[PDB]
Amino acid sequence: TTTMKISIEFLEPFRMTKWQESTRRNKNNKEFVRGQAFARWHRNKKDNTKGRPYITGTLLRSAVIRSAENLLTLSD
RNA sequence: UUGAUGUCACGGAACCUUUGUUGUCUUCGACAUGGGUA
């Protein structure tokens, strides 16, 4: 395998989801499903708010697939 | 700290209603103080 280092630079304030317990991270929780397009909060330990933000590779993948659809539309 | 053949969340105006307002002559006279003498 070969590794491609990337970085993302924001030009505007970005949105982030409210952290939720693992019993609630499923399709029947409206709050979790609505936040799936935002950034996430990670707690270092589940009983403390201490943590830091992150972005999933899945979301970037989805955005890239949409972009690829548009580019291939332009090139026929 | 994701999981992958499927994410329109740039898919959603913190928006809407509310009088810093009501009442009042820039006037006017008797009052302070605590003993003293048998």
From TrEMBL:
Query: What is the protein name given in its UniProt record?
Result: CRISPR-associated RAMP family protein
> Which species does this protein come from?
Desulfonema ishimotonii
The shown range, given as first to last of full length, is 2 to 77 of 1601
